[PDB]
Amino acid sequence: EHPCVSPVSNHVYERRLIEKYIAENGTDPINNQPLSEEQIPAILKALQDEWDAVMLHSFTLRQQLQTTRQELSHALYQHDAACRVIARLTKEVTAAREALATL
Amino acid sequence: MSLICSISNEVPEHPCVSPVSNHVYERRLIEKYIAENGTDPINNQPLSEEQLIDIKVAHPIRPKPPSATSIPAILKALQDEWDAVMLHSFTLRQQLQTTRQELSHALYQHDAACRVIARLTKEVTAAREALA
Amino acid sequence: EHPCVSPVSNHVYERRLIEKYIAENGTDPINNQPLSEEQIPAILKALQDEWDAVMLHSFTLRQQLQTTRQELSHALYQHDAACRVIARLTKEVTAAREALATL
Amino acid sequence: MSLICSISNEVPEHPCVSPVSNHVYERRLIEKYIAENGTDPINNQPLSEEQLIDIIPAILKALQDEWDAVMLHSFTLRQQLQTTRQELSHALYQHDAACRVIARLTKEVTAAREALATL
Amino acid sequence: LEHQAVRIENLELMSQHGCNAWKVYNENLVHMIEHAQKELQKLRKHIQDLNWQRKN
Amino acid sequence: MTTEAKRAAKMEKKMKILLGGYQSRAMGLMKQLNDLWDQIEQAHLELRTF
């Protein structure tokens, strides 16, 4: 019923119960600090939360993309080397074949 | 109570109590009022943002409805609600302007009634003097 | 030059200025508790603040209307109370003139 | 001075600084992040909220276009993530193929060396 | 397309949890009405108590 | 998108049946609530006069 809030636990109380507890304990029921006996928007919040979730999504995607892309980046310079080995081996297998072709 | 801010007549997002009036308030609104006016709003007693007592109770607040809503549709619905609010606020202007006229006309008739009462009081007294 | 935040004052300082004060004192520049050198939403916020201005003004209209509507209704009932007074007086005049007719 | 929040990569309305990373976060985002994650986004070290030291229709058309502008970037970031994954899957595929071709050729080189050793 | 993606994502939650949340919210309106009717019945009694003071 | 649009409509209309029952209650509750606030307002107005 009665309008009162503990200024240290920031919690909402019915004056009968909180004054009862303070008289015995001298203290707050939710954090046990002292307390003296006398002491559109839903749409905007949702749309803010729409923005909020997308930004957290955006970071996560950025994190996941960059993780994969780093591993990928190393492979590219190595990829050109990979073709070179097969090219080199195709020449070496040819050289070995021609030595076998000799006889 | 399931809180309502005393300024907006509606449930606050960031709630606080003024100890100077024990009413419940939506803190960014009344802090703006304090900066612009320096007083409690309900009873015009002096107030500061320091005196405000914070609340941290979570919100059960619910969409209205979720099934319609999407980002284009939210902005569509928000505009309509915006127009409804501006219609509502201008209606208050209209209402207040209307209450000016009706109160004023009422006041004239009650004032003029006193002059009649005065005359009738004389009439009654003269009639009692006649009885003497 | 290099923004760093003090956990005691919660303020952002310029690195050159805050280091000099710590170097002599070892304390916060605002209130001298211990400190060391090592230590679209704008659019929504703008629209929020516009909504804020609407509410505060509308409440002012609410507050003044309710006062005047009380005062209106009071004046109406005063007017109505006057009617009862005139109703009494009309009968009282009529009876007194009737009394004089008796002689 | 102006700042950038390290989750948004955009200017914070109300910023807070993780000392676990020396870098700026937009409080409502990071607390909500900490609620699920419990960790510093920059480096996945553990983090908790208390450590975070604190620091008409034309408008809605403008807001809508900027809302759409984020969504332009949203598809792009999703599609680039898919593309880098599609590149990575292909690049490993060709690398594994490159290993198998070179294994095929190493078998060829082995057989040919043995055949020349037979001589 | 991403607007549809975000939309369809919302519908998944809304099907399961929104049914319960509607029931909880509708209850909350009843609780506002119960508090209002209690205050109304307090007020109507008090007005009629005043009327009995007026009448006596 | 057109396949998703057809999906989104069908999913919603299933749900709009289910939640629409609760919606209909919500309209009744809110209408009553404004009426009762009018009753509270009118009574508190009248009490001031009396």
UniProtKB/Swiss-Prot annotation, chain D:
| Induction (record text) | By gamma irradiation and chemical mutagens but not by UV irradiation.
Q: How does it assemble?
A: Homotetramer. Component of activated, catalytic and post-catalytic spliceosomes. Component of the Prp19 complex/PRP19C/Nineteen complex/NTC and related complexes described as PRP19-CDC5L splicing complex and PSO4 complex. A homotetramer of PRPF19, CDC5L, PLRG1 and BCAS2 constitute the core of those complexes. The interaction with CDC5L, PLRG1 and BCAS2 is direct within this core complex. At least three less stably associated proteins CTNNBL1, CWC15 and HSPA8 are found in the Prp19 complex.
Which residues does the record list as N-acetylserine (modified residue)?
S2
Report the portion of the entire protein shown: 1 to 134 of 504
* Residues modified to N6-acetyllysine: K107
Q: What is the lineage of its organism?
A: Eukaryota, Metazoa, Chordata, Craniata, Vertebrata
Q: What is this protein called?
A: Pre-mRNA-processing factor 19
The entry's function note states:
Ubiquitin-protein ligase which is a core component of several complexes mainly involved pre-mRNA splicing and DNA repair. Required for pre-mRNA splicing as component of the spliceosome. Core component of the PRP19C/Prp19 complex/NTC/Nineteen complex which is part of the spliceosome and participates in its assembly, its remodeling and is required for its activity. During assembly of the spliceosome, mediates 'Lys-63'-linked polyubiquitination of the U4 spliceosomal protein PRPF3.
**Organism domain of life:** Eukaryota
Similarity remark: Belongs to the WD repeat PRP19 family.
Domain characteristics, as noted in the entry: The 7 WD repeats are necessary and sufficient to support interaction with the RPA complex.
Domain named U-box: residues: 2-58
As for subcellular location, the record says: Nucleus; Nucleus, Nucleoplasm; Cytoplasm, Cytoskeleton, Spindle; Cytoplasm
Q: In which tissues is it expressed?
A: Ubiquitous. Weakly expressed in senescent cells of different tissue origins. Highly expressed in tumor cell lines.
Query: In the UniProt record, what gene is named as encoding this protein?
Result: PRPF19
From Swiss-Prot, chain E:
* Superkingdom field: Eukaryota
The tissues where this chain's protein is expressed are given as: Ubiquitously expressed.
Q: Where is the protein situated, by its record's location annotation?
A: Nucleus; Nucleus, Nucleolus
Q: How does it associate, per the subunit comment? A: Component of the pre-catalytic and catalytic spliceosome complexes. Component of the postcatalytic spliceosome P complex. Component of the PRP19-CDC5L splicing complex composed of a core complex comprising a homotetramer of PRPF19, CDC5L, PLRG1 and BCAS2, and at least three less stably associated proteins CTNNBL1, CWC15 and HSPA8. Interacts directly in the complex with PRPF19, CDC5L and PLRG1.
What the protein does comes down to: Required for pre-mRNA splicing as component of the activated spliceosome. Component of the PRP19-CDC5L complex that forms an integral part of the spliceosome and is required for activating pre-mRNA splicing. May have a scaffolding role in the spliceosome assembly as it contacts all other components of the core complex. The PRP19-CDC5L complex may also play a role in the response to DNA damage (DDR).
Q: Which family does it belong to?
A: Belongs to the SPF27 family.
Q: What is this protein called?
A: Pre-mRNA-splicing factor SPF27
From Swiss-Prot, chain F:
Question: Which tissues is this chain's protein expressed in?
Answer: Ubiquitously expressed in both fetal and adult tissues.
Q: Which domain of life is it from?
A: Eukaryota
Please list which residues make up the signal peptide. Answer: none
The entry's comment on post-translational modification says:
Phosphorylated on serine and threonine residues. Has no effect on subcellular location nor on homodimerization. Phosphorylated in vitro by CDK2. Phosphorylation enhances interaction with PPP1R8.
As for subcellular location, the record says:
Nucleus; Nucleus speckle; Cytoplasm
Which medical condition is this protein associated with? Answer: A chromosomal aberration involving CDC5L is found in multicystic renal dysplasia. Translocation t(6;19)(p21;q13.1) with USF2.
Q: Summarize subunit and interaction data from the UniProt record for this chain.
A: Homodimer. Interacts with DAPK3. Component of the precatalytic, catalytic and postcatalytic spliceosome complexes. Part of a spliceosomal 'core' complex consisting of CDC5L, PLRG1, SPF27, CCAP1, CCAP3 and CCAP6. Interacts with PLRG1, Lodestar/TTF2, and NIPP1/PPP1R8. Component of the minor spliceosome, which splices U12-type introns. Within this complex, interacts with SCNM1. Component of the PRP19-CDC5L splicing complex composed of a core complex comprising a homotetramer of PRPF19, CDC5L, PLRG1 and BCAS2, and at least three less stably associated proteins CTNNBL1, CWC15 and HSPA8.
The entry's protein name is: Cell division cycle 5-like protein
State the organism named in the record: Homo sapiens
Q: Which residues of the full protein are shown?
A: 703 to 752 of 802
